[PDB]
Ligand SMILES: *C/C=C1/C(=C/c2[nH]c(/C=C3[NH+]=C(/C=C4\NC(=O)C(C=C)=C4C)C(C)=C\3CCC(=O)O)c(CCC(=O)O)c2C)NC(=O)[C@H]1C
């Protein structure tokens with residue numbers, strides 16, 4: 070099963086109980102964005118991140134009464150149609166708001182049962198993706214495909230280190246390709262134990278295909294209330310990219326000297342084949358539109374891995 | 383019966399009838415569609431060899447001036463990028479794309495690929511979260527039918543085409559329309575089936591390697607290359623990989639007879655085989671700009687993946 074989260078007086082995690090930390094329900098988010106939850110029917114704002122006032126520019130109480138209808142007039146009917154009752158928690162809808170306080174915000178919404186989860190992040194506003202797609206497809210074998218993928222991602226993102234991290238049948242991981250800035254340790258060829266990415270992290274990554282820690286030293290921002298009014302239970306945040314990273318994994322990243330981390334799942338035959346894993350030495354908020362490019366690349370790599378593995382077997 | 387290609391018309395080959403369809407050499411027509419321009423150049427020196435006859439009007443230069451310069455001089459910023467992206471021996475399927483600001487012609491999209499020692503350069507005029515939203519909707523579709531319907535509707539919304547169909551090949555190469563989105567008033571093709579020869583075997587082979595082809599105006603005359611043969615080889619210039627390549631006149635007649643002014647299909651490739659086509663129709667001529675066509679190319683790949691996934695959920 071899972072332990073209760075901390076804020077419901079559950080045990081603190083150790084290396085004895087890696088597998089039982091409820092990472093999906095941390096009750097908090099990373100501070101480079103803001104999150105609101107809301108009722109599926111009424112559009113009634115039920116929870117907000119204590120930092121919402123910053124991003125939205127709204128007097129705190131104003132929000133926690135109001136309706137999405139009021140708050141987002143153009144958007145609220147689109148949401149209603151895009152995310153019908155009963156849809157999967159994996160389905161997401163995005164829009165760009167030109168919002169008074171903040172030039173442009175990206176809005177990302179998904180639905181978990183009766184709750185809409187809304188994420189707001191700063192945003193903005195060429196051929197590198199098309200060029201990359203053809204490059205991946207003409208790679209002659211899996212090894213070269215891995216090399217092209219890591220190089221392409223590094224060029225698109227500027228990340229200090231990009232790896233392709235492949236799982237063995239026992240969930241031992243191996244770095245099979247790597248693109249990195251001069252003057253970093255090489256992780257190429259290294260294998261790591263399955264517990265470094267515990268089973269409950271791997272399952273969540275099979276369904277929700279991108280996560281990140283924008284700053285490995287930033288404090289999480291609580292949800293208020295912490296419990297969903299609807300259920301008097303924790304809000305599931307696993308489909309939210311803003312979700313606070315596990316403090317165990319933040320300790321892991323700091324001990325490696327990483328300041329920013331991001332990864333994309335490569336899913337083949339319904340299973341987690343591996344990860345595009347990225348490191349930056351310093352804090353780094355990759356903007357939403359560039360993340361989208363990596364999300365596309367994730368799908369394309371999933372296709373090409375199967376194609377390429379089929380021409381060996 | 384499968385038989386080798388006839389020589390093209392310009393090398394004294396025969397004219398093509400319903401009798402000998404499968405033998406038209408549709409990859410070497412010696413000509414392009416008039417809404418863009420094409421140059422060929424030597425892959426090592428960058429000497430310009432062939433050009434479409436309309437090139438002066440896209441590129442704003444006399445032929446003899448174009449042909450008298452190397453790509454190093456014509457494309458000083460792109461020439462080194464081309465050479466890195468398209469190394470000798472690379473496959474003909476690999477494409478490099480850039481946007482140019484050309485004085486006379488505005489923003490041009492440049493698409494380049496390499497066939498042996500030849501570079502092929504295509505120039506076309508070029509111009510929010512719809513793709514991301516579509517990607518997730520496709521993935522959440524519960525079964526093959528719902529996927530097919532979401533895919534057709536999405537493509538129609540992105541493009542404005544009068545008719546978008548998902549055409550699926552059977553094992554005997556007969557096809558069947560299995561989903562479609564269509565303009566009000568058009569008659570339905572859903573559930574209809576068409577003989578295997580409607581798309582002969584040399585077209586299906588090409589359609590497994592080069593995943594997007596089109597006919598922007600089914601009444602437009604083709605524009606010859608000049609000279610027609612590659613001076614490197616005194617042989618035909620391979621245009622299989624060029625979206626500007628002229629469509630088979632057999633096929634343009636089949637389209638005009640249907641009332642179609644514009645056609646475009648994306649290949650859906652599963653396990654190395656052509657599974658089906660996203661086929662689109664417009665009643666009037668219609669040019670879809672290169673950046674919009676890129677969205678369809680990306681959806682072609684997504685759909686190939688999702689078709690595998692939906693079919694595996696099915697035994
Ligand atoms: C008691 C449990 C421990 C634990 C937990 C844990 N680990 C993750 C997630 C990740 N761990 C990763 C590991 C590596 N990254 C590398 O670069 C290398 C090798 C050079 C390794 C071995 C990775 C890539 C992830 C994914 C997330 C990311 O990209 O940063 C989680 C989940 C975190 C979250 O999503 O909130 C958890 C709980 N890690 C341990 O080492 C043990 C002690």
Ligand SMILES: *C/C=C1/C(=C/c2[nH]c(/C=C3[NH+]=C(/C=C4\NC(=O)C(C=C)=C4C)C(C)=C\3CCC(=O)O)c(CCC(=O)O)c2C)NC(=O)[C@H]1C
Pocket residue numbers: 399400401402403404406408557559571576579580581582585595596597628629630632633636645646647659661662
């Ligand atoms: C004597 C040969 C004939 C022939 C040749 C031919 N056909 C193609 C390509 C295509 N034919 C298609 C047929 C259909 N379009 C539809 O909308 C339907 C059903 C409602 C069918 C059956 C299609 C879709 C294509 C693909 C290209 C496109 O999307 O337009 C070629 C190759 C063309 C080229 O690449 O230049 C050739 C030679 N078709 C016949 O019917 C016989 C008479």
